[PDB]
């Protein structure tokens, strides 16, 4: 099967319409929630420009490419992937009309280029070098969370967000590879979310109150078996020779009492007293008669620890894995400043904070253990990836449409490349910019024409970056509202839109192959 | 959809209509499921077994849907049921008619976010005036009458005809013994059906009630250590082998001699280790039995899966089949072990009493289990209704009289504000109205005869409908001043959780 | 009956009028095309003209009834631009479709149309300049105005003919011609040939071997219903009431043939001298051959088969008294023509009356035996005579060919129609509907239609100069130095007619059958 002269372009642009149309109410606080039950046949609550692409069982080849293109944007920005979907179908709308008038796509693609770098010239003009103060970091974190979840949930979470990124400035890191551990607490209300500087251990040491308050924690993150499986083999599994299998039994019970006695020599090796604590995090279960005997020695011994916690506790606190408890100095182990066993739900959740090195900060959300807990998981994830860009750049800009009409004023009125061939592509380019402020306010009730004439005048009047209030439908100045975008984010959505627009525009045949 | 992509089950018609239409049909069976009922719901199951019930949580788990809007809300109805008792009937029927009103705002041309934020302002303002509609409290939970006054509404929410005898009997079976200062059994209140002795002869038996027949003599002491075993004792029958019907009967006699001395030592080692009662989830051996009578150890002939797990929780035992001579790793907890004849059946009675560690178990006696397993559903939410985790439960008007008390406030509050959220606050007061309109249609009159009066009476708190003639023609029934009460907490979550579900399911278009 | 009450009811309405415009998009230009039109009984007609293609034959559209009404008033008031008015409203529906496709009110689009005209009507005062009543000034307008309506080779043969016809007035203030319009078709060897002669041409001359051909100071005796009766100006039947009453009439009729040629010849001795001055008899009806002998031997140029329409303009052409009798009423009942001459070319004899007291009636002698040419060359006349008369009635002519269209659209820059932006809506679809006349020509030419259109705008913003689109290349050029100038009477009227019906379309959101 082949796709000829008109149809190969037409399927590409028509699919970009309804993709943009369904993904309309997903950006900003006007952006509505979405569910998939047709991506995996499960009750799923999902919101992102990229994540909704990855879950839906799409067969149109353009949206499959955009899921690849916005992935490169989602690796840096997160949110803004749903910003990229809106501008593509609008950009394809104006240029198709010129092709509907009869025009080469390449001369418009030629006009797509010089229109872009004038906007890229305008991005240096419109960037606003603000400080990376916490309240300035709050306003970025407010508009990132209210895009995905409620504002009442956002402001509780915004308290926990902006403090961890100030902790990664202690490590002088502009990006976020650690301090991004999302831990989830068994609750029924997701209204609560706690911030722990160190880690959160998810277990509670079957005989409790061994040592629940440890002021001097010398951590051992190991996985030593004390409930050891005892097998008699002659073939690698159970065999028929009853004479042979009997002689191995006498050494099997000598392994359990071996690992109990090794704990006693290690406590006197590290601490020397009971005033200084000692914490054993075992990835496996521990004997409760050992948990009675270790509790009297001044040892708390946490059991059945998660294997994901096993590496991260070694990074921030410390403590390496063994299968013995041999005499080790505190140099071989790590340290934590404070250990407290917290309880909420059917499991005890031991808090472990103020590490040997506070390198990873655990974001502990509470919730009803639903997809709502999953929906607040990726919301704060994209909340952290947005303010990741804030530590990257120096210029935090009022967004939400403030730059969008400000570009299109300079593009249409001032021909950058006054030769008429490229200004045709400028007209499609500047009209592509209008789609984000005009339709979200039109969704809010004040239609698109009242919003555009207000924000074009006021920005041309003031020069102050008036944005759009997505909760009234009328333009309000985003500098005081706190709906802001980064200099890192706004470049890439301009970058990722243009390159993926031109190549699908410059096709003429889509042939079945392979 | 124009292209090969975009797999979705919602859209312009389907999100506006069919999501609400799916929530309509689930709420269609719950039109009469809270308060006075003439409504009954026969179900054959995934087990394909005939049952009739009036608890939606039994119905909705039998119900399946591909609509995620219809699927999500029944989890929030469970969240109220996990927190408070009855009112899980209310969460679906309130949010169901709530969303139908939201369609009408979408008929006009209102934005969805205006409809989203409209009930949210209405949800907060109603939660402000709601503790001002607290009319009483459980001042004495030790009193039988004040406890039974709360329980008559939740039993009515399963059946009006058994609301008064059971509310006494539950207080006679003592949820009253809990101070509720962090004291509430969830499985030591577990209702025990005893077949026979028809449903008004249902009785009271504090502590753990076991229907299984007591075999052997009674325990040596009531302070006995309780040994709870999965299958210690066996029973022998076999058939034709690899070569049919084995070559002799001598080894059959040789295996039978050691089998008796095995179970001789099993009852002996339990007697040696201190436990004077054995719990057998498997059957009873005859050779095990006649040594157990001389050892004065009480035996249970058989136990199910639920019998062992309550014993492993309450007593604190470990359930495992003993193919070895058993030792005590079970740590018997109950200091009083009785045998009682309940329904003329040998009933194992375990018992201990503590301040915040007591046990008090509902037992029922009725001539039909298929009747009595629905009567216990009237008991199931009623016991959890006592879990407000407070003594003074801040009692509000029962029956639904608070709904018209609220609806006067909310549409007045909806008139004062401006906006397009302005209309959804007024529609929120209409959402209180739909439930007594659906109940009065089971009472036997039209809704407009009824709902005119309950708005016209005044801020009163008392005026409502039951299922009497006073419910029908005058529409005035003292569902506050005749032993009909509800608590603040069950009313608080059921409005809250129905709101957060309906706001959630309204935004989605995919 | 059945109803259609939706936005689709408007959507069917706006769809029909755009497609009918794109059929007429083939027309309107020297690079535009003639449209072949065939009647119901069949007749080949090659017209580029708007009103003839619209009002005569059309297909079933409710919009076709609507556009016939507004192109009537354009044809009524001006008679030109009946091609031009269709192309505006087709695009005017097109960009206005997009905002209601986005979803907006039909009335908020409507109200911006009125402010669009008012900002442009004041601009029409700016863009026109005072041009002269010179012939050569009207040469540049006529050949330009013909090429937008008819073919350029049709424009070249008529550029000298049309301008000299309308110039014969004495400052008569009228926007179209009335008596200059006289078309005498003629079977020729050349299909395309055009002769303008001052005065009225007679559709049929006459010849006797004694009849004169050139007469001067020709005293016209205008004549009618013929020799057989007497003192009649209208025909009559015969008496059938008695059998003798039928016979007694026709026996006397030959005597009245004698008597009425007698009155004519005795008036020639009295007024014309002996034969010293010319005498002309113009009979509406047939000439009896006995009087063809008696008149021509007197020295009288008698004429045969005139029209009564020709009789009425002959009263203006002689300026004196044009009778309808043969008998002697009075000698001062004769109009005067200083020169009457009958020139015979082809199959037909054509008699001219010249030295007119009123230079108000001229006649284009129209060549061509083949009817499809003879229709088309006649169709170029009537639109040519009215349009240039609009240019001479106007003291100010607009420079045309699309140069105003980019000029107003830049001058319609927004935030000046700012009240709610709903006025910015209707001016914006208006400015894009301005550019169709540069869009149609570079479509019909090379130099792709919107690729060079923005190059017109880039040059027009430079120094404010009026730059147009070439009729043969599509290349940018100044409209003033080239002289591609349209009628201002077309251009002023064009704003009114295009505004009101697109308003009326947005008032129609229901259709009932």
Curated annotation (Swiss-Prot), chain A:
Component of the chaperonin-containing T-complex (TRiC), a molecular chaperone complex that assists the folding of actin, tubulin and other proteins upon ATP hydrolysis. The TRiC complex mediates the folding of WRAP53/TCAB1, thereby regulating telomere maintenance. There is a cross-link at residue 240 (Glycyl lysine isopeptide (Lys-Gly) (interchain with G-Cter in SUMO2)). The modification Phosphoserine is found at residue 194. It comes from Homo sapiens (Human). Keywords: Acetylation, ATP-binding, Chaperone, Cytoplasm, Hydrolase, Isopeptide bond, Nucleotide-binding, Phosphoprotein, Ubl conjugation. It catalyses: ATP + H2O = ADP + phosphate + H(+). This is T-complex protein 1 subunit zeta. The keyword Repressor does not apply.
From Swiss-Prot, chain B:
This is T-complex protein 1 subunit theta. The keyword Acetylation applies. It comes from Homo sapiens. It catalyses: ATP + H2O = ADP + phosphate + H(+). Belongs to the TCP-1 chaperonin family. Its EC number is 3.6.1.-. Component of the chaperonin-containing T-complex (TRiC), a hexadecamer composed of two identical back-to-back stacked rings enclosing a protein folding chamber. Each ring is made up of eight different subunits: TCP1/CCT1, CCT2, CCT3, CCT4, CCT5, CCT6A/CCT6, CCT7, CCT8. Interacts with PACRG. Interacts with DNAAF4. Interacts with synaptic plasticity regulator PANTS. The modification Phosphoserine is found at residues 10, 149, 200, 256, 304. Its main location: cytoplasm. One of its GO terms (cellular component) is cytosol. The modification N6-acetyllysine is found at residues 305, 387, 453. There is a cross-link at residues 211, 241, 247 (Glycyl lysine isopeptide (Lys-Gly) (interchain with G-Cter in SUMO2)). It comes from the Eukaryota. GO terms for biological process: binding of sperm to zona pellucida; chaperone mediated protein folding independent of cofactor; chaperone-mediated protein folding; positive regulation of protein localization to Cajal body; positive regulation of telomerase RNA localization to Cajal body; positive regulation of telomere maintenance via telomerase; protein folding; protein stabilization. InterPro entries: Chap_CCT_theta, Chaperone_TCP-1, Chaperonin_TCP-1_CS, Cpn60/GroEL/TCP-1, GroEL-like_apical_dom_sf, GROEL-like_equatorial_sf, TCP-1-like_intermed_sf. The gene is CCT8. Mg(2+) binds at residue 86. Disulfide bonds: none annotated. ATP binds at residues 87-89, 157-158, 399, 486, 491. GO terms for molecular function: ATP binding; ATP hydrolysis activity; ATP-dependent protein folding chaperone; cadherin binding; protein folding chaperone; unfolded protein binding. Keywords: Acetylation, ATP-binding, Cell projection, Chaperone, Cilium, Cytoplasm, Cytoskeleton, Hydrolase, Isopeptide bond, Nucleotide-binding, Phosphoprotein, Ubl conjugation.
From Swiss-Prot, chain C:
It holds the Pfam family Cpn60_TCP1. Its main location: cytoplasm. The keyword Acetylation applies. GO terms for biological process: chaperone mediated protein folding independent of cofactor; chaperone-mediated protein folding; positive regulation of establishment of protein localization to telomere; positive regulation of protein localization to Cajal body; positive regulation of telomerase RNA localization to Cajal body; positive regulation of telomere maintenance via telomerase; protein folding; protein stabilization. The modification N6-acetyllysine is found at residues 189, 277, 355, 367, 378. Component of the chaperonin-containing T-complex (TRiC), a molecular chaperone complex that assists the folding of actin, tubulin and other proteins upon ATP hydrolysis. The TRiC complex mediates the folding of WRAP53/TCAB1, thereby regulating telomere maintenance. This is T-complex protein 1 subunit zeta. It comes from Homo sapiens. The lineage of its organism: Eukaryota, Metazoa, Chordata, Craniata, Vertebrata. The gene is CCT6A.
């Amino acid at each position: 099967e082949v796709a000829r002269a008109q149809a190969a372009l037409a399927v590409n642009i028509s699919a970009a319409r309804g993709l943009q149309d369904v993904l309309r109410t997903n950006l900003g606080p006007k952006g509505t929630m979405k569910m998939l039950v047709s991506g995996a046949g499960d009750i799923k609550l999902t919101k992102d420009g990229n994540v909704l692409l990855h879950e839906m069982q799409i067969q149109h080849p353009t949206a499959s490419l955009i899921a690849k293109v916005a992935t490169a944007q989602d690796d840096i920005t997160g949110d803004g992937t749903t910003s990229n979907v809106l501008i593509i179908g609008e950009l394809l709308k104006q240029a198709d009309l010129y092709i509907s008038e009869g025009l080469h796509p390449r001369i418009i693609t030629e006009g797509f280029e010089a229109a872009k770098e004038k906007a890229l010239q305008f991005l240096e003009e419109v960037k606003v070098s603000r400080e990376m103060d916490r309240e300035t970091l709050i306003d970025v974190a407010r508009t990132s969370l209210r895009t995905k979840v409620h504002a009442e949930l956002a402001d509780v979470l915004t308290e926990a967000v902006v403090d961890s990124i100030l902790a990664i400035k202690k490590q002088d890191e502009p990006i976020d590879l650690f301090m991004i551990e999302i831990m989830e607490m068994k609750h029924k209300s997701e209204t609560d979310t706690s911030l722990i500087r160190g880690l959160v251990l998810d277990h509670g040491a079957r005989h409790p109150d061994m040592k629940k308050r440890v002021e001097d924690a010398y951590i051992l993150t190991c996985n030593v078996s004390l409930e050891y499986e005892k097998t008699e083999v002659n073939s690698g599994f159970f065999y028929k020779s009853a004479e042979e299998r009997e002689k191995l039994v006498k050494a099997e019970r000598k392994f359990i009492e071996d690992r109990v006695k090794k704990i006693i020599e290690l406590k006197r090796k590290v601490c020397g007293d009971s005033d200084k604590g000692f914490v054993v995090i075992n990835q496996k279960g521990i004997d409760p008669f050992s948990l009675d005997a270790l509790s009297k020695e001044g040892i708390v011994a946490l059991r059945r620890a998660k294997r994901r916690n096993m590496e991260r506790l070694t990074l921030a606190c410390g403590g390496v894995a063994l299968n013995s408890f041999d005499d080790l100095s505190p140099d071989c182990l790590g340290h934590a400043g404070l250990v407290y066993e917290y309880t909420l739900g059917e499991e005890k959740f031991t808090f472990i904070e103020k590490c040997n090195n506070p390198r990873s900060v655990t974001l502990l959300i509470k919730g009803p253990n639903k997809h709502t807990l999953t929906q607040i998981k990726d919301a704060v994830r994209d909340g952290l990836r947005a303010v990741k860009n804030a530590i990257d750049d120096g210029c935090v800009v009022p967004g939400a449409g403030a730059v969008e009409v400000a570009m299109a004023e300079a593009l249409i009125k001032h021909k950058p490349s006054v030769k008429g061939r490229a200004q045709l592509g400028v007209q499609a380019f500047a009209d592509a910019l209008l789609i984000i402020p005009k339709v979200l306010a039109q969704n809010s009730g004040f239609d698109l024409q009242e919003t555009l004439v207000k924000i074009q005048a006021e920005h041309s009047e003031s020069g102050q970056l008036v944005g759009v209030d997505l909760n009234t439908g009328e333009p309000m100045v985003a500098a005081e509202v706190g709906v802001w975008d980064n200099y890192c984010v706004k470049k890439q959505l301009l970058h990722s839109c243009t390159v993926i627009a031109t190549n699908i525009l410059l096709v003429d045949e889509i042939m079945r192959a392979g | 959809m124009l292209k090969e992509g975009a797999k979705h089950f919602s859209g312009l018609e389907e999100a506006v209509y069919r999501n609400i239409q799916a929530c309509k049909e689930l709420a269609q069976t719950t039109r009469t499921a809270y308060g006075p009922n003439g409504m009954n719901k026969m179900v054959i199951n995934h087990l394909e077994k005939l049952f009739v019930t009036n608890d939606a949580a039994t119905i909705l788990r039998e119900l399946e849907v591909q609509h995620p809007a219809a699927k999500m809300i029944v989890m929030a109805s469970h969240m109220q049921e996990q927190e408070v008792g009855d009112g899980t009937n209310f969460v679906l029927v309130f949010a169901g008619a709530l969303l139908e009103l939201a369609e009408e705002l979408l008929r006009i041309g209102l934005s969805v976010s205006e409809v989203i934020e409209g009930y949210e302002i209405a949800c907060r303002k109603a939660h402000e005036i709601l503790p001002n509609l607290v009319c009483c409290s459980a001042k004495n939970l030790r009193d039988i009458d004040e406890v039974s006054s709360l329980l008559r509404t939740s039993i009515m929410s399963k059946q009006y005809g058994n609301e008064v005898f059971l509310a006494k009997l539950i207080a006679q079976a003592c949820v009253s013994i809990f101070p509720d200062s962090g004291h509430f059994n969830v499985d030591n209140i577990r209702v025990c059906k005893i077949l026979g002795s028809g449903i008004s002869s249902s009785s009271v038996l504090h502590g753990m009630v076991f229907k299984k027949e007591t075999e052997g003599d009674v325990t040596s002491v009531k302070d006995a250590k309780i040994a709870v075993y999965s299958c210690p004792f066996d029973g022998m029958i076999t058939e034709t082998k690899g070569t049919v019907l084995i070559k002799t009967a001598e080894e059959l006699m040789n295996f039978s001699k050691g089998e008796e001395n095995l179970m001789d030592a099993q009852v002996k080692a339990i007697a040696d280790t201190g436990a004077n009662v054995v719990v057998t989830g498997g059957k009873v051996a005859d050779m095990a039995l006649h040594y157990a009578n001389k050892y004065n150890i009480m035996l249970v002939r058989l136990n199910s899966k639920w019998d062992l797990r309550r014993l492993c929780k309450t007593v604190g035992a470990t359930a495992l089949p003993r193919l070895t001579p058993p030792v005590l790793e079970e740590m018997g907890h109950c200091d009083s072990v009785y045998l009682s004849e309940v329904g003329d059946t040998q009933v194992v009675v375990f018992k201990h009493e503590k301040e915040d560690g007591a046990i008090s178990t509902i037992v029922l006696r009725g001539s039909t289990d298929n009747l009595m397993d629905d009567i216990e559903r009237a008991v199931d939410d009623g016991v959890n209704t006592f879990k407000v985790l407070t003594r003074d439960k801040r009692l509000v008007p029962g029956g639904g009289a608070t709904e018209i008390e609220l609806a006067k406030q909310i549409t007045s509050y909806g008139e004062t504000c401006p906006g397009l959220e302005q209309y959804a606050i007024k529609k929120f007061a209409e959402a209180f109205e739909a439930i007594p309109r659906a109940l009065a249609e089971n009472s036997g009159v039209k809704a407009n005869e009824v709902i005119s009066k309950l708005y016209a009476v005044h801020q009163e708190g008392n005026k409502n409908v039951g299922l009497d003639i006073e419910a029908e023609v005058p529409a005035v029934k003292d569902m506050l001043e005749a032993g009909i009460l509800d608590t603040y907490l069950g009313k608080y979550w059921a409005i809250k959780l129905a709101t957060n579900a309906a706001v959630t399911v309204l935004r989605v278009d995919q």
